[PDB]
From a paper:
Although we set-up crystallization trials with the entire zSmo ectodomain (residues 29–212), the N- and C-terminal regions could not be traced due to missing electron density and thus were not included in the final model. The small interface between the two zSmo [name] molecules observed in the asymmetric unit of the crystal (buried surface area of 490 Å2) and a crystal contact formed by a zinc ion bonded to three different protein chains (one chain A and two chain B molecules) suggested that the dimeric arrangement observed in the crystal is not likely to be of functional significance. In agreement with this crystal packing analysis, purified zSmo ectodomain behaved as a monomer in solution at low concentration (5 µM) when assessed using multi angle light scattering. The zSmo [name] monomer adopts a globular fold composed of four α helices (α1: residues Q77-N92; α2: P94-Y108; α3: Q122-N130; α3′: S133-E138) and a short two-stranded β sheet (β1: K43-S45 and β2: K116-E118). Disulfide bridges I, II, III, and IV lock the four helices together into a tight bundle, whereas disulfide bridge *, formed by the N- and C-terminal cysteines, orients the termini in close proximity and away from the helical bundle. Structure-based evolutionary analysis of zSmo [name] revealed that the closest structural relatives are the CRDs of Frizzled 8, secreted Frizzled-related protein 3 and muscle-specific kinase, shown clustered in the blue branch in Figure 5B. To investigate the putative oxysterol binding site in the Smo [name], we calculated the volumes of potential binding pockets in our zSmo [name] structure. The most prominent groove is indeed located at an equivalent position to the Fz8 palmitoleyl-binding groove. The residues forming this groove are highly conserved in all vertebrate Smo CRDs, and the volume (551 Å3) and shape of the groove is sufficient for 20(S)-OHC binding. Computational docking using AutoDock showed that the hydrophobic groove on the zSmo [name] surface can accommodate 20(S)-OHC with a favorable free energy of binding.
Smo consists of an extracellular N-terminal region containing a cysteine rich domain ([name]), a heptahelical transmembrane segment (7TM) and an intracellular C-terminal tail (C-term). Smo belongs to the G-protein coupled receptor (GPCR) superfamily of proteins, most closely related to the Frizzled (Fz) group of Wnt receptors. In the absence of Hh ligands, Ptch1 inhibits the function of Smo, a 7-pass TM protein that is encoded by a human oncogene. Our work now shows that the Smo [name] in vertebrates binds to oxysterols and mediates the ability of these lipids to activate Hh signaling.
Numbering used by the authors: 41 to 158
The structure:
Amino acid sequence: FCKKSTTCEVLKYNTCLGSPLPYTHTSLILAEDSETQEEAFEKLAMWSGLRNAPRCWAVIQPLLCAVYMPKCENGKVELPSQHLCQATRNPCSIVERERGWPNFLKCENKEQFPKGCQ
Ligand code: NA
Ligand SMILES: [Zn+2]
């Protein structure tokens, strides 16, 4: 329940939004707007507008990477934490005005963002 069972695929990129990754396997099961890694790349660049607000970017960048390019290992993908999600709501509240959060990026989604597994 802190992880989701899935089939891992080899990462086509070694970088998520500037950050080098310490893993080479991923899954697209968490990003409900992407079916391929090439689509996840496109959607990730779409979120890169939040760079102009450092206090938003500091928390939203690790979260988006945990959703779009998460670590897959031994048939399981890791789930992003509820604490990390809630930290984004306030400094990134501009999203609510401009487009709103997708269901897979809402904190009320307890199966996507469970608490405990930090
Ligand atoms: Na998907
Ligand atoms: Zn491998």
